[PDB]
Amino acid sequence: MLLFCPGCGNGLIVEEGQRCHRFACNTCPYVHNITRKVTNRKYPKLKEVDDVLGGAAAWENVDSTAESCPKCEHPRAYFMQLQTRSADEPMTTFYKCCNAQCGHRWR
């Protein structure tokens, strides 16, 4: 930890004297011998995440259900709408249909 001298208030460092390890300041003859054990834990953060991802139930966090696509007309789908282009007057669509492991990706 951070310790300060009661005399002048400067930071105390740990050195070795003639009898035992002691805290001392660099601007005053104040010292303090260590009698019992002193500890300073920090408890660093541990890795809690298992880093497992990609589940089909978690992936199907989308609105698209029971629609009709021009590729395989399967019910389960995955739609995305984009409006980030002023030159294109209409909007932009991205539809994916992987109900029977098709994996389509078009505009």
Closest approach of Cβ 68 to Zn ion, in Å?
7
Residue of 67, 77, 79, 81 lying closest to 102 (CA atoms): 77
**20 labelled ligand-binding:** no
Burial of 64 (0-12, 13-18, 19+ CB in 10 A): middle
Could you say which of 26, 65, 92, 99 contacts other proteins (CB under 8 A)? 26
Stretches 1-9, 60-68, 77-85, 95-103: which one binds other proteins (CB under 8 A)?
1-9
The answer to whether 93 contacts other proteins (rule: CB under 8 A) is: no
The answer to whether 25 contacts Zn ion (rule: CB under 5 A) is: yes
Q: Kindly give the pairing relationship between strand 31-33 and strand 78-82.
A: unpaired
User: Which residue, 35 or 61, is less far from other proteins as judged by CB?
Assistant: 35
The answer to whether 75 contacts other proteins (rule: CB under 8 A) is: no
- Percent of residues in the chain assigned helix, strand, coil, to nearest 5: 5, 20, 75
**25 labelled ligand-binding:** yes
Spatial separation of the C-alpha atoms in residues 41 and 67, rounded to whole Å: 58
User: Which residue, 36 or 47, is less far from other proteins as judged by CB?
Assistant: 36
Spatial separation of the C-alpha atoms in residues 17 and 7, rounded to whole Å: 20
Residues found near Zn ion in the complex (CB under 5 A): 5, 8, 10, 25, 28, 30, 69, 72-74, 97
